[PDB]
Design a protein around this ligand. Structure first.
Ligand SMILES: *[C@@H]1O[C@H](CO)[C@@H](O[C@@H]2O[C@H](CO)[C@@H](O)[C@H](O)[C@H]2NC(C)=O)[C@H](O)[C@H]1NC(C)=O
Lengths: 232, 129, 120
């Protein structure tokens, strides 16, 4: 029996404006003897709603507990613990989740790399990478789009942040999206959207296509008329 | 110090300076010089406020509509003060962005079904909210 | 109209021309200025409106100012203030100068880059 506690994310705060706590419990044999509750440091009771999921193929059951807390409760760093009690566990399981302090704010940087030249020759698929680096803390939210249409959560993948060996305190992550070769050869556009607290407007976006980003040639035309006009 | 700036456009990044060189010694044989400096962007698109617009590969620079004055000036006539129109010639396209200006956009953000449109920053840094 | 090239070779004087045209009715007031101070009236002569042969109902007039050649070569500025009833603001102004005229040299320079997408 293992318990996973997920602290609230910045995206959930921005796009929903309601701080929530979740301590998922798995590897449960009986769902009629489970209880999920949250207790404060001083012992004040917190209202928690417990939900029961379906039956997993491995003869296990998962319980989901969603509870409403004030943004201050989490942002203050107040240490919270989720209480899980079961008849098969001689001692209740306790998990400690909190937000660390002494963290500065650093604006992240975003760059897109176009698909490799020798990948398009096979005419199978193309891969685009969105590299975001130089940020703290380590909670980011990257979403891909195609000419204003949000893309499905399944066509792109993202990686957990990892420390940067060069400069400590600044992290990085990247998102990889695949596309059809003909679709990319047509000339469609793609956008990378990242949400973080350090940004002034809190969201930034960048756009790449076939004509921009490692192109083959540059075609320019210039016209300069009325060169002998009145200036005064 | 020896050059006078006439126009300092930012959208077309055009800058014109004029200078007189005292060539030889005859006052009637001094040449008048006009310098034009243009910086063209190769990555910006047709509409700088819409990332989906196609790329731009044609640039037109009319000098008659660049060195033009369009602000009423005050003139003293020993009995009153009046406002005077500098030129009668007075939708222009902005090729490049302006540092003193902020460029923003609207983008749909989906998360758990709900869609929250949020103001973005097309420019890298520019100004802050 | 800036002074003629064949006039300044005599080292004697110059002649600037302020031309107002195509206006109705035939009423016009022209006055010259320099550095914001009115010039002496004699330095200039203004004529009466005259009909335009190519357009019925329209007139035109002229004004002539005389200045020294060394003053013009120094680089002084002049102004022609014209007032008529049909103007949007009733007063118009133009300025002529030696530097901002016809240049012998056109040093044009063009710089191409793929990263300068903004100008301060
Ligand atoms: C260039 O893009 C701008 C921004 O999309 C266009 O102007 C906007 O038009 C929409 C409606 O279509 C309005 O909601 C916005 O308020 C407009 N922007 C501003 C700043 O007023 C503009 O029309 C586009 N130009 C061309 C030629 O398509």
């Amino acid at each position: 029996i293992r318990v996973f506690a997920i602290p609230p994310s910045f995206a959930s705060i921005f796009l929903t404006k309601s701080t929530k706590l979740t301590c998922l419990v798995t590897d449960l044999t009986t769902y009629d003897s489970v209880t999920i509750s949250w207790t404060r440091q001083n012992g004040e009771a917190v209202k928690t709603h417990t939900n029961i999921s379906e039956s997993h193929p491995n003869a296990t059951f998962s319980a989901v507990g969603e509870a409403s807390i004030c943004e201050d409760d989490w942002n203050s760093g107040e240490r919270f613990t989720c209480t899980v009690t079961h008849t098969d566990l001689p001692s209740p399981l306790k998990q400690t989740i909190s937000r660390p302090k002494g963290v500065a704010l650093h604006r992240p940087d975003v760059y897109l790399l176009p698909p490799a030249r020798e990948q398009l020759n096979l005419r199978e698929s193309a891969t685009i990478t969105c590299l975001v680096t130089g940020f703290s803390p380590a909670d980011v939210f990257v979403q891909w789009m195609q000419r204003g249409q949000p893309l499905s959560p399944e066509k792109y993948v993202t990686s957990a942040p990892m420390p940067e060996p060069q400069a400590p305190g600044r992290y990085f992550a990247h998102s990889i999206l695949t596309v059809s070769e003909e679709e990319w050869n047509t000339g469609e556009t793609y956008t990378c959207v990242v949400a973080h607290e350090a940004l002034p407007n809190r969201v930034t976006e960048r756009t790449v296509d076939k004509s921009t980003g490692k192109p083959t040639l540059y075609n320019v035309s210039l016209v300069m008329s009325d060169t002998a006009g009145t200036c005064y | 110090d020896e050059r006078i700036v006439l126009v300092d456009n930012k959208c077309k990044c055009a800058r014109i300076t004029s200078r007189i060189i005292r060539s030889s010694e005859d006052p009637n044989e001094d040449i008048v010089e006009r310098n034009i400096r243009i910086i063209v962007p190769l990555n910006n698109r047709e509409n700088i406020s819409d990332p989906t617009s196609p790329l731009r590969t044609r640039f037109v620079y009319h000098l008659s509509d660049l060195c033009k004055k369009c602000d009423p000036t005050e003139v003293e006539l020993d009995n009153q003060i009046v406002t005077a129109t500098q030129s009668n010639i007075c939708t222009e396209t902005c090729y490049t962005y302006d540092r003193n200006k902020c460029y923003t956009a609207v983008v749909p953000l989906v998360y758990g079904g709900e869609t929250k449109m949020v103001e973005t920053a097309l420019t890298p840094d520019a100004c802050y909210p």
